[PDB]
Design a protein around this nucleic acid. Structure first.
Lengths: 73, 77, 76, 72, 73, 76, 77, 71
DNA sequence: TGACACGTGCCTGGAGACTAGGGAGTAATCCCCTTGGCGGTTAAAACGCGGGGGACAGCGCGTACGTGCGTTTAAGCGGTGCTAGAGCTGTCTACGACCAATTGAGCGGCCTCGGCACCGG
DNA sequence: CCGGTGCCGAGGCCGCTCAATTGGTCGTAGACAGCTCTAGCACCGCTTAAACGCACGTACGCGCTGTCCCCCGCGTTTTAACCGCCAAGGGGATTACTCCCTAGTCTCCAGGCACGTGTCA
């Protein structure tokens, strides 16, 4: 399967449970996957920029922290 | 702990990065931070869309609820 | 233009400033900028509560609609 | 001496019209006034904080702009 | 004067001439100044972020180039 | 070919950077790149607002033309 | 909804595709996504050209307004 | 072909875009603009299809083409 | 010491509140079919030992490399007073170019079937 | 080594909105003038680009070390996908209702201004 499918239905269900959601429409899972992909893309795009600025080939935790800070997170 | 499984999210992040820069290699701490942040953001989004669902007297959340929650919170929707 | 009357806003901001510090005057330009800012904030919040009302199978905005909009935005 | 009541019902109606609202419940206006007061307090609080840091006795436009930035 | 006044009226006029503008309303200059501040702020915000990521105290040309690229210019 | 004066723009950059992080020192090349890019961006914005002014059968650019050019380009 | 009719847009897309490459078929979902994207682009361009027309002290949008909007946006015009 | 995007459809698109009055010549002009847009997106889309050696344009190919034509 | 903000007074149009009218969007309810939630199951991807290999992050140090400063000056550049003219803007006009509506109908969309293209378990 | 999914083409129906032609009208480009504002000429200040020393914070490159990223096996493992039954509810329709939209009138006031007064770096 495509890697977006690795965010499984029960994982999205668990996330919704933590968010206080009691009942979940079947279309939620696909919608959530799309939203998640967009979020991830944005964060990682910034993260990789930070990685490139340091002339490193390994994305570090600090790259991620700066990406998250500079986004609404 | 982390609700999302570790290896699927790791593979997804590695795929997105191989799209962006291809040669990139992730630290375990960086992937764990990405996973924690994405899980917190999705939990907040699901809480806000649950508020939107209860607003319409529906216990079930709908994709329109998530669209409204993202439109109000400032994200592109 | 501006949709809020200028003199009631002056007296309101004067009463609000009286609480924190006494007689710290405002330039008229600062009052006009603050009034434009409150105009923008109120029109944005009313747009958001209109979106809420359109989402709730309604056309009339209600106090619960604006409360939900403020809680979703993150204000309170 | 409530000054918040000077922001009259037709003014709030006009604000809602500019916001694209077609119909408005009667209780919103009182609710809106409360909301407005809170916003103003917060902004003015920051503005005054900046003013106090600058030790000035006249709030300037820049003080307000900085307050708004640090609030929005 | 405030530093925003250092982008002088003849400087803004010269920029407009290079931009092909033949006649300029008197209110343009203050407006242009406001626009510049927003642009600069955004770029500088990113620039300073880059500076902080490198654990440096000197903003470098590279910080600025990355900030400018990621702000679309 | 830098139309903006170097020292006033440097002072402005330093002031704007004081807010983000205090006691930050800029390289000369960094300030040169900032100035070049800001001048190029202002030149592009002025080209667009001149196009807007020519559109309205005018030759005098006005702030409304600048707001229109910024709104069309996705900045407002 | 989709304001453009489905079958004429399908025909036009297949024409331009056959211009580019032959025997290169499209899925129904791909055509639907492309049509949604093109409709969004058209409504955005029409919003921009309406702004252009309003700026020119007019209420009726004209081809030159779309030309100006596309020149300011940055497209090949 | 390009004539299948009919005049009332273009009018509806303009209405959704907030346009109140519409010149008669816009439609022909809009059609030209539309064709250019489509060509560009499809060109990229086809490039992705050909580059991946799949020969089948996928929904993801189109999404990537659109992104790279709007980034 | 000189420019900026606060308290009085008139008044006139400009706007706010009241109640008369009403009706239409909003509130409570029922059931029909939909569609999530949950019980069983098994295996297929998850997830930690464990050798193991090492590309590369993090840190320490030298060095010169570029920042900031004291001081000048001068001279190209900026603030400004005044002017002649060129365009902004408000207005009249008229007529080509816009919007609605109905009518034949011509293509969309659903319904269904024969035909193969094709990467794949 | 053949197979299920999907695309293309065709027969054929309803159906519904597409083009044209008419009428109505309107609103916009051209002409015209009052206004205003501004690009430029010319003066006098000014403050900035560069050049001396001058000291100096530190950016960067190079090297060393560890150190955790990638690799696979791999045993267990446990829970995801799927299927089927149970039942909660989304919502479309229905009926009542009540309170918010116009709005003319009586009444309050925004600010324009005109003036006098106090205030602060």
């Amino acid at each position: 399967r495509d890697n977006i499918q690795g965010i499984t239905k029960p994982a999205i269900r668990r996330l919704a449970r933590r968010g206080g959601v009691k009942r979940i429409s079947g279309l939620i899972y696909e919608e959530t996957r799309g939203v998640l992909k967009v979020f991830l893309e944005n964060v990682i795009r910034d993260a990789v920029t930070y990685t490139e600025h340091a002339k490193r080939k390994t994305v570090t935790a600090m790259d991620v922290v700066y990406a998250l800070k500079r986004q609404g997170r | 702990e982390l609700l999302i499984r570790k290896l699927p999210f790791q593979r997804l992040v590695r795929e997105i990065a191989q799209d962006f820069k291809t040669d990139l290699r992730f630290q375990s701490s960086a992937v764990m931070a990405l996973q924690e942040a994405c899980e917190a953001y999705l939990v907040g989004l699901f809480e806000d869309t649950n508020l939107c669902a209860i607003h319409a007297k529906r216990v079930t959340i709908m994709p329109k609820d998530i669209q409204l929650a993202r439109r109000i919170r400032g994200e592109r929707a």
